[PDB]
Amino acid sequence: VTLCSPTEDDWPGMFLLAAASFTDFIGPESATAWRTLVPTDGAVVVRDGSEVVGMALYMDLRLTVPGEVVLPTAGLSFVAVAPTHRRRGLLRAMCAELHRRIADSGYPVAALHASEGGIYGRFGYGPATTLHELTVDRRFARFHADAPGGGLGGSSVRLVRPTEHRGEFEAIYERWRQQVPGGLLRPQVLWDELLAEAKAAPGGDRESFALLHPDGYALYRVDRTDLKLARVSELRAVTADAHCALWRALIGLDSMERISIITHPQDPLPHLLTDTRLARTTWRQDGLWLRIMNVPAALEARGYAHEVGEFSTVLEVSDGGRFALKIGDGRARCTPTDAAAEIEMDRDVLGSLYLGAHRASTLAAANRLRTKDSQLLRRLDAAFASDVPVQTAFEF
Amino acid sequence: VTLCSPTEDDWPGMFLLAAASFTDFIGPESATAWRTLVPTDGAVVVRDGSEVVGMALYMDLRLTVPGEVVLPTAGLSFVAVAPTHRRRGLLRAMCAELHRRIADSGYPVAALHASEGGIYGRFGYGPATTLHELTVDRRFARFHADAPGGGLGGSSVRLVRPTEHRGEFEAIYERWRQQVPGGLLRPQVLWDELLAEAKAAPGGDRESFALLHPDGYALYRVDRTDLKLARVSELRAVTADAHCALWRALIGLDSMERISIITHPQDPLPHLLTDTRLARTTWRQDGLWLRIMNVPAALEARGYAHEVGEFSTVLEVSDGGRFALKIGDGRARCTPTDAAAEIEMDRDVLGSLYLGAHRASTLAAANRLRTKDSQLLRRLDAAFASDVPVQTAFEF
Amino acid sequence: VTLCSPTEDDWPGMFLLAAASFTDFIGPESATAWRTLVPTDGAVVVRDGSEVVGMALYMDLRLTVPGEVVLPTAGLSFVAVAPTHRRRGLLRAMCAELHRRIADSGYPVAALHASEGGIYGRFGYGPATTLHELTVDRRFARFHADAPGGGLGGSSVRLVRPTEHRGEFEAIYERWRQQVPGGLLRPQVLWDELLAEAKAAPGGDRESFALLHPDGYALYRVDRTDLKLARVSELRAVTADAHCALWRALIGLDSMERISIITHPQDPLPHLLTDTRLARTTWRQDGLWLRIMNVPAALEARGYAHEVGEFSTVLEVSDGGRFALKIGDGRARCTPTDAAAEIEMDRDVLGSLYLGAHRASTLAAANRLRTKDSQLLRRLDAAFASDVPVQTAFEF
Amino acid sequence: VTLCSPTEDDWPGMFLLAAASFTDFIGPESATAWRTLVPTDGAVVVRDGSEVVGMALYMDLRLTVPGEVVLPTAGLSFVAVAPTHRRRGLLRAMCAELHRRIADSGYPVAALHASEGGIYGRFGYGPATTLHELTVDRRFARFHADAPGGGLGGSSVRLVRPTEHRGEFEAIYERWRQQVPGGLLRPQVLWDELLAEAKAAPGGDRESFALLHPDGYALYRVDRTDLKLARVSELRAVTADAHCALWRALIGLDSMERISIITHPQDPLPHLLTDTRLARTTWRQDGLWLRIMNVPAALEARGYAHEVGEFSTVLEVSDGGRFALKIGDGRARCTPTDAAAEIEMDRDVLGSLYLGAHRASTLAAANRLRTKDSQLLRRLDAAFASDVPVQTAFEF
Ligand SMILES: Nc1nc(SCC(=O)NCCN2CCOCC2)nc2sc3c(c12)CCCC3
Ligand SMILES: Nc1nc(SCC(=O)NCCN2CCOCC2)nc2sc3c(c12)CCCC3
Ligand SMILES: Nc1nc(SCC(=O)NCCN2CCOCC2)nc2sc3c(c12)CCCC3
Ligand SMILES: Nc1nc(SCC(=O)NCCN2CCOCC2)nc2sc3c(c12)CCCC3
Ligand code: NA
Ligand code: NA
Ligand code: NA
Ligand code: NA
Ligand code: NA
Ligand code: NA
Ligand code: NA
Ligand code: NA
Ligand code: NA
Ligand code: NA
Ligand code: NA
Ligand code: NA
């Protein structure tokens, strides 16, 4: 039980453990694409004296945070302990080694998608974005008088084969990810992967169609088993016009009873309809999780609300340092101090505040975030809040 | 088809229509209690040349709004058109008459709970609060190290018969409703009603139990059919200690698999657990709906965020007037003007902003709220936002 | 194991066997009402050397058959063999004794409702009417331009308590049963019974409401468990106006998703809607079963289609006699002959033809009805067919 | 938005719209077969200034109507409006153009299968045949003494691979379609298609088997998911012997719990069993829809019941002409008149009467068919009724 960087001879063993550990595993030939995003010394394996009983790696990602600021992000992925080697501290050992490497490489943040909601808090990760399934019963769906693009003349939305409009989707996604907190750069190899899953699989998923606007696209497919349900896999709109136009087109799928989509809590769709209730929230879950690797570097890099006035405090992160935090003009200055702390939180809590998805008041109500001054609580709420609402880019 | 105030001879006819129109109708003897909250000239009936084919009324309510300010509120209820008299403009006629009376009586706002989400927007009502069902699989539920009241010595929470601690529940609810936006004064007759539904019904609901803290209570009962589910009908906590203590007690119901509760989007419960995901959102729906009867009187009466600086604009409400709105020091001054409008919205949209549940940015994204200045949008978002998170009191 | 007419001392034993044999048993106090319809020597019990292990009886009924002709009918009911005395020929013995008594009393027909579809063919009973559940998704239901009573002014349909309009329901049902094949006289005691089941039972069925027209009524209640379903227990309309008006009222139950009713295959409801398919057939089953006790007396008593011309044939019923059958001017003459049979059928098959629900062609295709002349088959089809479509009155 | 006949360059665009509009779409290579049945100028597309946003076509069909008379029939199919171009009158425009072409080509009738039951009435189509799912619990199924082919010696039914007995199936279907109202000529290319779907698909449908009689065949396969259910896709029997023999074989599938089939309301199967109720009606829906293009040409072409005597009337079809209709000797003469109408109906209603599936009395009860003389109603019922019961051939 020694902890090493994998050699090329180790990957077949890692793919075996992946196949047994993740039910959604897309096989080795598809894993070559994602492997391009793993830097040299981005992966750790544990061997038993021999085969692979343990693995974890990070990918080089670019995360957009409030103020349209793009951070280098270590994306944690492909974490797996053999069923034969549980309760043996292999995860603790692997996560520690990667965090060392992530820290020493100069990543201010790491991020992951959690398989369970109870594992990653202890390693410093906080849930930072919220996933939100909306299901529209589109038979009753009528658009409000106030809704855009409900006038005579032509539609701007086209129905198209995804594979023949890759360039337009890239262009739109690139505009989208740069201006939305939670946005991730989607490299070429992940566009290759995304469009290979657009085509119909024998006894698998059905053909994916696209609705294409100058400033938006929606990829959808009819469900395998439920043939009256369209699953919107991905809708990216840069303008409210594009968003609305795309939903007029989706509500126009007259052979479907229900359109479903995984979106964000602030999706304006419910307000496009004469009946808000027709867009039911069927499902809600933690999206992206953040570990703030370097507190001063992260707090300084993001923009803050211009609306709150200048204010200063001392933030203590448990075993992560104490800081004089001065916020004003939507910039922050974060500097070492030994002054008495006014606000205390574990590092995972800072992850949950960092993109604006969670309010400091809420975490304080749970005593995850201690302060004796509620004026300071309101000011943190206001400053950390995001003007553009926070969204989840793509699962990794 | 003439529209009149009911006489005592009209109520049996109204109770007949109620029994046929609402499946949850609690019968005449229980309707005597609610009738005490209907003012003289609070009810309209439509007769056909004869029996009651139409009815609507308002109750005298006291609604808490941001800044711990209590408004007189006309609560719209008991609205029903005979199945024999649909598509005949009886609702339009009845709602118009009540709104006339509500306006001329000096109510700044009316409120209702909607049976459908598509009827009430056209009459000026906006969804103002969000209901949120959390279901905890309590078998996996462990409280976080940071959570309050996890130390040795005694528990402060007692298990009790609801009927023998009415005074303590009243006291706690009275403290709660005065300090929470969406709070409603619960009069004596509704406490009589609430505790009569605490006892077990033959072949109906099971006995209700209470968890009692100095600063909180929870009423729960095991589900009729699912005997591994506890339904928390009502949890009122005044302090974070009370909230946490009550959930330790609820998670301690070792014979249940699932605790469910209808709460608000900012409920801190998910953050009390080591696994946020164990508190699943199973259901989400519009709660209280607001019609702003008098725009200047309502906008002036509520508190605003101290965090946003002083700012002025011209608000047009469609067919509801145009106003110079000046917000600063968490007060608003709202005065008539004929100056060019900077912000336009239908009256229902103002209802949805009024308690802070919905962001102006979100409604703007849906074009329910028109402005050409996004700086003004951020300022409205910030000013209208509620420091204490908005909650739904009781259904009427 | 001797077969006797019950004494008053035998009924408690019969009620015990009834409670164990029929899950829907309405108890002894309610069985006093139905007992009034059992004639002296209408009931047989089997005792074991002692308690009741066997029972069967007939009730005095008046059945309407084609040509608005009302026949005295022995209604077979309350048939039960102890679970302790199966496969012992007690049913065969009891049915034989009752049929003897029914025959010798001068009933031309007996009728029953079957608990199973496989028992009663061998005793000479044929399924004579078809039950047909229609379920309307009333959210999509719009009436056709051509539909009656879709013009301005008042509705003629009232919503009422069943118990306060007994006289009007009786009057309408009495008009209905006299003019519809399958109609049964409903005596006073069965109107007492029907209205006692209109009221809500503690942890049972909900309150029943009535829609009342001068020429029609509908009794409905919301389902116990499914609160979005209205079950129409009974709709009697004498004119197409009444039928349509009542369905406009039922489709107006805006709190229901689905209206369900057990009706007949020729119910015009599907054709009242712009979308026939909205009235789905969810369920279909044999209704009333007929045993022709006296072939000549029954064939002579009913009217025949005036459209088919005069024609003669020889009908053989297996072990039920051979007859010269002459049909013309919608009358039949049925006389003994020893002439060669042109048409053969078991007696149960004649029951199935007798009210016009089943076509002779269909039964011939199944070889239940033998002839070597298809011209004669078409003529039987045409003559036996009912101008007024055949309906099921009430279960007994 | 111009309306044109498609060029060969337009089909890829039509196949894209087909894939997105119909979930059952069988792909382009299979659509080449059906394309052979589309005449020159049988198809219309709508382009947007460019891609295909609209399409509709008719196929050359031969429909059997009562009196074993075969009509040329325009079969409407492949109708689709882009989700991006709803509520724009593209369907109205396309249907109008095709009906013009269908009329001017000399088709007396058009027919279609409806995706929804609410679209096609306004374009003059009436539901003309009824689909009827029977499900047999074959564990309890015993054949009646009277049933054919229940004697000793050999069975005449063989179990066979469909692909090796194509000639025998063709021969039987050809005999069947010529003698049954609703019958359609099945051309070579549709037999190619039918037998390609007989073989097992990887992770799709299972292998199809055939039961083969000299005068009948049944194609069945075990259900994908439910392995105790045999789905009879198609049973064609020319003689009652063949029908019965085939069901003895199907009830002999001792590894199945349930045999299901989509058949017609007059299927004699229920009467083959000792228990009629074992053949439950699980599902019922409109089959083939008819638009009478030329009222006199259609009314004159079909046979009428010989049983009803000679009679004359004036039929008005709304915006379809008024006619002196004289029916006798099972022929009709239909001639222009300006005499007062005795019977009025919309054109769709005539479609519903034309094959005998619906009774004029029933449509009159719904006021779809106005007359002041009920004697004339009985005579129309009798004359339009079909001696051979009406069946649905194959979906298109
Ligand atoms: N990061 C990756 N993601 C995917 S599919 C996107 C997705 O939604 N994953 C959720 C579930 N995961 C499944 C797999 O990783 C853990 C949990 N596929 C591959 S192959 C592969 C990676 C990789 C990492 C780099 C090495 C080889
Ligand atoms: N306002 C009232 N509320 C209740 S129960 C609380 C509740 O949750 N109602 C939701 C459904 N409603 C059911 C009834 O009113 C409409 C929809 N019960 C009565 S009796 C009664 C009222 C009344 C108004 C005053 C007159 C007589
Ligand atoms: N004929 C009767 N009918 C009813 S309820 C109508 C009904 O729907 N019955 C269907 C099921 N049956 C249940 C009971 O009889 C067999 C199957 N209730 C009583 S008490 C009673 C009878 C009687 C006969 C006369 C003697 C005492
Ligand atoms: N007429 C056709 N039918 C079939 S499959 C038989 C079937 O059951 N269709 C029901 C659903 N339809 C699905 C497709 O057409 C609308 C609704 N497949 C093709 S490819 C094709 C046609 C065609 C028309 C000619 C042009 C190309
Ligand atoms: Na980015
Ligand atoms: Na969206
Ligand atoms: Na963190
Ligand atoms: Na209050
Ligand atoms: Na709570
Ligand atoms: Na409002
Ligand atoms: Na009668
Ligand atoms: Na009916
Ligand atoms: Na009989
Ligand atoms: Na044909
Ligand atoms: Na069949
Ligand atoms: Na027609």
Evaluate whether C1-128+287-291 and C129-286 have a shared fold.
yes
Across the interface, whether the CB atoms of B23 and C252 are under 8 A apart is answered: no
Nearest to C249 among B1, B49, B83 (CB): B83
C170 is in an annotated binding site: no
C366 close to D (CB below 8 A): yes
Residues A219, A242: Cα–Cα separation, whole Å: 14
* Residue environment code for A150-188, b if the CB has 16+ CB neighbours within 10 A, otherwise e: eeeeebbbbbbbbeebeebbeebbebbbeebbbbbbbbe
Nearest to D48 among A154, A211, A227 (CB): A154
B167 close to C (CB below 8 A): no
A246 close to D (CB below 8 A): no
CATH architecture of A129-286: 3-Layer(aba) Sandwich (3.40)
CB of A22 closer than 6 angstroms to any ligand 1 atom:
yes
Across the interface, whether the CB atoms of B274 and A118 are under 8 A apart is answered: yes
Closest CA of chain C from B288, distance in Å: 20
Measured between CA atoms, the residue of chain B closest to residue C223 is: B23
Interface test with A, best of B142, B143, B144, B146 (most A CBs within 10 A): B146
Give the residue numbers of B annotated as catalytic, written as ranges.
Answer: 120, 396
C345 close to B (CB below 8 A): no
Task: Give me the CATH code for the B292-387 domain, please.
Answer: 3.30.1050.10
Q: Write out chain A residues lying below 8 Å of B346, CB-based.
A: 146
Breaks in chain A after residues, C-to-N cutoff 2.5 Å: 49
Q: How far is the CA of A290 from the centre of ligand 4 (A)?
A: 51
Residues D243, D217: Cα–Cα separation, whole Å: 9
CATH of A1-128+287-291, one of 3.40.640.10, 1.10.20.140, 3.30.830.10, 3.40.630.30: 3.40.630.30
Tokens of A241: 């016009």
Report how many Cβ contacts below 8 Å link chain B to chain C.
Answer: 51
Residue having the nearest C-alpha atom to atom 23 of ligand 4: D34
CB of D34 closer than 6 angstroms to any ligand 4 atom:
yes
Pocket of ligand 2 (CB under 6 A): B 22, 24, 26, 31, 34-35, 38, 57, 77-78, 113, 395-396
Tokens of A259: 């359109």
Across the interface, whether the CB atoms of B51 and C158 are under 8 A apart is answered: yes
Closest CA of chain A from B196, distance in Å: 32
Q: How far is the CA of A136 from the centre of ligand 2 (A)?
A: 29
| Residue type for position B310 | E
D16 close to A (CB below 8 A): yes
A207 close to D (CB below 8 A): yes
Q: What single DSSP character describes residue C356? A: S
For residues C90 and C54, is the Cβ–Cβ distance under 8 A?
yes
β-bridge partners, D245: none
Residues C175, A35: Cα–Cα separation, whole Å: 83
- Return all residues near D115 (Cβ < 8 A) that are at least 6 apart: A255, D22
| Residue type for position C100 | R
Residue having the nearest C-alpha atom to atom 14 of ligand 1: A78
In chain B, where the domains are located: 1-128+287-291, 129-286, 292-387
Q: Tokens 């009535």: give the residue.
A: C210
Nearest to D365 among C116, C118, C240 (CB): C240
- Return all residues near C17 (Cβ < 8 A) that are at least 6 apart: C52, C53, C55, C80, C82
CB of A34 closer than 6 angstroms to any ligand 1 atom:
yes
**Residues flagged as binding site of D for acetyl-CoA:** 79-81, 87-92, 115-116
* Residue environment code for D265-276, b if the CB has 16+ CB neighbours within 10 A, otherwise e: bbbbbbbbbbbb
For residues D202 and D237, is the Cβ–Cβ distance under 8 A?
no
CB atoms within 10 A of CB B145: 11
Across the interface, whether the CB atoms of B84 and C155 are under 8 A apart is answered: yes
The number of C-alpha atoms within 13 Å of B155 and in the hemisphere containing its C-beta is 14
D100 close to C (CB below 8 A): no
Q: Write out chain C residues lying below 8 Å of D306, CB-based.
A: 378
A255 close to D (CB below 8 A): yes
Measured between CA atoms, the residue of chain A closest to residue D85 is: A155
Tokens of D1: 């938005």
D115 close to A (CB below 8 A): yes
Q: Write out chain D residues lying below 8 Å of C378, CB-based.
A: 305-307, 387
Closest CA of chain B from A286, distance in Å: 7
Tokens of D3: 């309306």
Across the interface, whether the CB atoms of C154 and B48 are under 8 A apart is answered: yes
Across the interface, whether the CB atoms of A277 and B283 are under 8 A apart is answered: no
| Residue type for position C54 | G
Residues C337, C318: Cα–Cα separation, whole Å: 14
Measured between CA atoms, the residue of chain A closest to residue D23 is: A227
CB of A189 closer than 6 angstroms to any ligand 1 atom:
no
Q: How far is the CA of D78 from the centre of ligand 4 (A)?
A: 6
Tokens of D367: 């006021």
C186 is in an annotated binding site: no
Q: Smallest Cα–Cα separation from A125: which of A361, A309, A292?
A: A292
Q: Provide the experimental method for this PDB entry.
A: X-ray
Residues C101, C106: Cα–Cα separation, whole Å: 9
The number of C-alpha atoms within 13 Å of D44 and in the hemisphere containing its C-beta is 25
From the number of C-beta atoms within 10 Å of its C-beta (0-12, 13-18, 19+), residue C100 rates as: exposed
Report how many Cβ contacts below 8 Å link chain A to chain B.
Answer: 141
Nearest to B276 among A117, A280, A365 (CB): A117
SS3 B267: coil
Across the interface, whether the CB atoms of A266 and B361 are under 8 A apart is answered: yes
SS3 C162: helix
**In this structure, what are the phi and psi dihedrals at residue D250, rounded to the nearest 5 degrees?**
-60, -45
- Return all residues near C209 (Cβ < 8 A) that are at least 6 apart: B19, B20, C159, C160, C161, C162, C219, C220, C221
CA dihedral C45, C47, C52, C54 (to 10 degrees): -50
- Return all residues near D78 (Cβ < 8 A) that are at least 6 apart: D14, D18, D43, D55, D56, D57
Rg (CA), chain A: 23
CA dihedral D129, D130, D133, D136 (to 10 degrees): -90
Residues B374, A300: Cα–Cα separation, whole Å: 25
Q: How far is the CA of A263 from the centre of ligand 6 (A)?
A: 6
- Return all residues near A265 (Cβ < 8 A) that are at least 6 apart: A130, A132, A389, B265
C contact chains, 3+ CB pairs < 8 A: B, D
Closest CA of chain A from B7, distance in Å: 35
CB atoms within 10 A of CB D355: 27
Nearest to D268 among C243, C366, C389 (CB): C366
B contact chains, 3+ CB pairs < 8 A: A, C
SS3 B361: helix
Give the residue numbers of A annotated as catalytic, written as ranges.
Answer: 120, 396
Nearest to B86 among C154, C203, C254 (CB): C254
Residues D371, D365: Cα–Cα separation, whole Å: 11
Residue having the nearest C-alpha atom to atom 21 of ligand 4: D31
Tokens of A84: 């034969």
- Which atom in ligand 4 lies closest to the alpha carbon of residue D113? 10
Tokens of C23: 């899950």
CA dihedral A89, A92, A94, A100 (to 10 degrees): -150
Tokens of B102: 């509500």
Tokens of D358: 């619906």
Q: Smallest Cα–Cα separation from D193: which of D20, D13, D37?
A: D37
Closest CA of chain A from B343, distance in Å: 14
For residues B236 and B393, is the Cβ–Cβ distance under 8 A?
no
| Residue type for position C93 | A
For residues A346 and A368, is the Cβ–Cβ distance under 8 A?
yes
| Residue type for position C367 | N
For residues B237 and B243, is the Cβ–Cβ distance under 8 A?
yes
Breaks in chain C after residues, C-to-N cutoff 2.5 Å: 49
B118 close to C (CB below 8 A): no
Strands (E), chain D: 2-4, 43-47, 52-65, 69-81, 109-113, 126-127, 130-137, 158-160, 209-213, 216-222, 229-237, 258-263, 279-286, 288-292, 311-317, 321-328, 331-336, 343-345, 369-371
Q: Smallest Cα–Cα separation from B317: which of B286, B290, B292?
A: B292
